[PDB]
């Protein structure tokens, strides 16, 4: 497996962590590119199509929608050996998330909200997952990611109240199939 490069394609679902400031879960296309430093140490990049979340509270409901790209870079450790058909793994790394295409809905505007945007964020990331190596060519995968994503939302409330701290700190769940290149 040393020298190997494999790509996984599948669903990645982001579940943001905590009157009420709720944020919906969203599932998008997930892609990971990984390389084997050795038979156990791997280098992986997670990529995704942009995610879309709705924000809101109990009474009003949705008041805005937000999108972001959470590209993540990881150093990993695969258990077992190069011949194991079943290899769980763990990783630690750095995440970078950018928010874009953020706007309040009619309801947000009716309440006096406008000019919304969130500033970029960097943060620790951890992961545990499993690869089931079917052939020298294919595999199926599961993956659970944790990510430090702290930001601050900027917008005006009829006036200019443009600063609040948003903490997503989401878990990301990924299911995929992967191809191997030797």
From Swiss-Prot:
UniProt keyword Transport, yes or no: no
Entry's Gene Ontology BP terms: transmembrane transport
SUPFAM superfamilies: OMPA-like (SSF56925)
Keywords: Cell outer membrane, Membrane, Signal, Transmembrane, Transmembrane beta strand
A cellular component term, taken from the record's GO annotations: cell outer membrane
Compartment(s): Cell outer membrane
InterPro entries named among the record's database cross-references: OMP/PagP_b-brl (IPR011250), OMPW (IPR005618)
Entry-linked Pfam families: OmpW
PANTHER family: OUTER MEMBRANE PROTEIN W, PTHR36920
Family under the similarity heading: Belongs to the OmpW/AlkL family.
Biological function: Acts as a receptor for colicin S4.
Name of the protein described by the UniProt record: Outer membrane protein W
Gene source species: Escherichia coli (strain K12)
Lineage: Bacteria, Pseudomonadati, Pseudomonadota, Gammaproteobacteria, Enterobacterales
Name of the gene: ompW
